[PDB]
Amino acid sequence: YEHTATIPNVVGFPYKAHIERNGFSPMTLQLEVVETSLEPTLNLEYITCEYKTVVPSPFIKCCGTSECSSKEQPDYQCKVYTGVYPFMWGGAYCFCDSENTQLSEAYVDRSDVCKHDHASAYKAHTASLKATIRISYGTINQTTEAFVNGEHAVNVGGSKFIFGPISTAWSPFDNKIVVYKDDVYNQDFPPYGSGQPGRFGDIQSRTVESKDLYANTALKLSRPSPGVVHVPYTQTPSGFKYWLKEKGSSLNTKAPFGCKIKTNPVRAMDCAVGSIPVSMDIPDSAFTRVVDAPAVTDLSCQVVVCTHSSDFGGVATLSYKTDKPGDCAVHSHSNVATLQEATVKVKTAGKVTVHFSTASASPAFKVSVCDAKTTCTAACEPPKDHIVPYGASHNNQVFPDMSGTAMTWVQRLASGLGGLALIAVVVLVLVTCITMRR
Amino acid sequence: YEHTATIPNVVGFPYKAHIERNGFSPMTLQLEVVETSLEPTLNLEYITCEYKTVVPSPFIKCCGTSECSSKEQPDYQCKVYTGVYPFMWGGAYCFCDSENTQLSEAYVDRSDVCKHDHASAYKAHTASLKATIRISYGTINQTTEAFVNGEHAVNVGGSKFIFGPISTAWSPFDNKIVVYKDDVYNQDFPPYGSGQPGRFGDIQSRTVESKDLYANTALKLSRPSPGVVHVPYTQTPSGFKYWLKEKGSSLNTKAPFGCKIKTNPVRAMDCAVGSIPVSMDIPDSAFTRVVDAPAVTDLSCQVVVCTHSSDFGGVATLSYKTDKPGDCAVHSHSNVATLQEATVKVKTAGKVTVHFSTASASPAFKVSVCDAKTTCTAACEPPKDHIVPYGASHNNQVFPDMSGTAMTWVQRLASGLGGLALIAVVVLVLVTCITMRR
């Protein structure tokens, strides 16, 4: 039996889907989203980490000269300084007072811990949503993971569910992402081969292991101080070690819709956005036949108390006649007010209670109990507590029923002025017939 | 020096970009695409392979009976058959003539070679070009791999190049892809958990190594023949071993634009589609100053021969008056004809020859040598050979020059009829003037 629903993508909000069927007593399923995991597809652009600057001992050539030569190493600098006369602890290092040259050499390399302390610049796109749904109905009460697309049928109790395409493609990850340990950053990182000194990605590596490193750290050698051996040099400090303090708080503290951001893999958990279609194929063995169910009749509804609070702040008492005791599926056919319980034990004592949640000062909604249907109506007070630690169980529909007091006054006004306008029309049509004839 | 070009995404077409600059003698770069690799992002949906049907020996209980149990194994079938009376080679297996049962049991498993002989169903999206470009100018003559987006500067000879976003996002891979060894198949494979018996994906596994296997092979047990031990059963033949003979030929034989399709990773090589923007940042050290270049003057052209064949079928000798010998850059400013050589050795002998490829019956194009410019004009014959093993070196622009013989005849006809029409208009207007005076 194919049935379709559309549940909110709201975690821990148990949606009730009501399946009325021809030969069988109606069935209510609960569909509660236990988790979701919106996971982007990632392309690694490059790895960044602190640089190491490699500065050998100066090749001081006493009484001679020592030409420099190029090398392939990143940001490599080499210069030969003529006319040095350096001292060591025991005296001058060279015999010649001026015919000496110091070869100074320095270059940049990936740090020794870059395998362990690095940030990955990713492009992030085409997110796929996996949800954990709890399905329950009758004896079946089971939790199953499903990919939220029109293309993964998951078995529950012999039923197959397809959780159709998520209503919106939205995701909190921008097109460019930086990932670092537990944290994710929306960050327009500099393209590979164009990173700049003292900013994130001043050195860049296409992978943690890659032999080829882009480095642009503005390393410049300068001439050694007179009589001093030290290979002096200036270089712009590590842009990664600037980023680590400049980061701010990560996307986990900033994502919309209450998303909780996690890494390994990069995913946005529990984003309370959109709605999930469901296709439900329920077998006949799930239902009970109308010959088995109680013949609930003359169902009526009285609301004992109602508060339009965020929890199940209203209490209905349902009263009826029945031929036998037994379970009945119970539902509210209006989003004005949702019900706490999916099923009720109908008993020959002829009365039942059902708890409901609404956002409106005067709801009206058609409850059913098995085949029987009735209209509940209430006067609902506002709550006293301004703020609560839980989300609404209602659908936030606030427009009052036309039988409510506000709409009653509106009806009395509009029928008063309309009746006066009708009398004015009657008078004018009467007179204008006379002035047509005469 | 920021400069921009746009090269055809045609492998081995040696596009030549001409830089004209105020302080410096002009420069022609070659930009030859050696390879492209259009690689889709792949999400693995599931693994398919031939199933192994596991059928234990029949548990025949003599003089007794057996219950049986459901097991959480794929496609698992079990039935107990009452009243068996089997014969082994030496006689009846059981004493009792009807108080016996055979427990027949069978289930589906993944085949033992599914680690090796399996097909992986992927979704393919947001393909990224990588291209191998050969850059040459002067003594710099070098090959660099670049990602073709506006976001990867590569250094050649101290010059940055950015190969901008490919003009079209086309790729030969459909949204759903099946990969098998060297082959890629465009194939709408069945969603996971919905594969059907005897067709591709009758068994499905989310990964090669996963513990959980979907199976839907229509395995059914049937009663053992009287007096025979054999566990009879029917099952639909492996949908993967049907697919292997039904595949046909892979996307490698069918992709548009001449794409060559390869795996590990899935990539479409050398697709001849679109054009690649280029940004150049050439340093001044690459140029030569106009004080150093030849002062080429009195440049004039005659075309010694021209066939508008797919190769460089035209030859144009350039007569010039220099002041010194030197290397001059040479370029053709009109895309009706592409030159073969980017530079020419200017000699005091005052003549040299240049080869060009054209597709039109009569091109005219502004050749330049250093600063000097002249218009070459030709009358080009068609080639004799109907088919050639190589692509056109020209841009396939075929409209003739307005000074060509066809357009000369059109100009004669159109100016003759236009002149006669103007004379008729003048006669009419003059007659209207005279009859206005009268």
Side-chain angles (χ1 to χ4, degrees), chain A residues 3-8 15-18 31 162 164 276-280:
Chain A
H3 180 271
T4 65
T6 292
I7 70 179
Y15 182 91
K16 278 79 175 189
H18 195 227
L31 301 170
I162 295 166
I276 295 168
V278 195
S279 302
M280 309 155 72

Side-chain angles (χ1 to χ4, degrees), chain A residues 41-43 45 123 125-126 128 147 149-153 155 160 175-176 188 191-194 206 214, chain B residues 41-43 45 123 125-126 128 147 149-155 176 188 191-194 196 206 214:
Chain A
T41 307
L42 300 174
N43 301 95
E45 287 280 18
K123 281 176 174 158
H125 63 79
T126 315
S128 67
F147 284 86
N149 53 42
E151 296 196 308
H152 180 200
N155 284 302
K160 277 190 175 189
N175 187 59
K176 286 181 183 174
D188 188 14
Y192 183 93
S194 75
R206 280 297 192 178
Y214 171 84
Chain B
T41 325
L42 298 172
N43 296 149
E45 287 282 12
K123 282 176 173 161
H125 53 76
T126 69
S128 56
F147 286 78
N149 52 45
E151 297 191 304
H152 179 191
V154 68
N155 265 257
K176 288 180 181 177
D188 189 10
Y192 186 87
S194 76
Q196 298 299 323
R206 280 298 193 177
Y214 171 85

Side-chain angles (χ1 to χ4, degrees), chain A residues 285-296:
Chain A
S285 61
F287 300 81
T288 60
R289 297 185 173 279
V290 298
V291 185
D292 306 329
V296 183

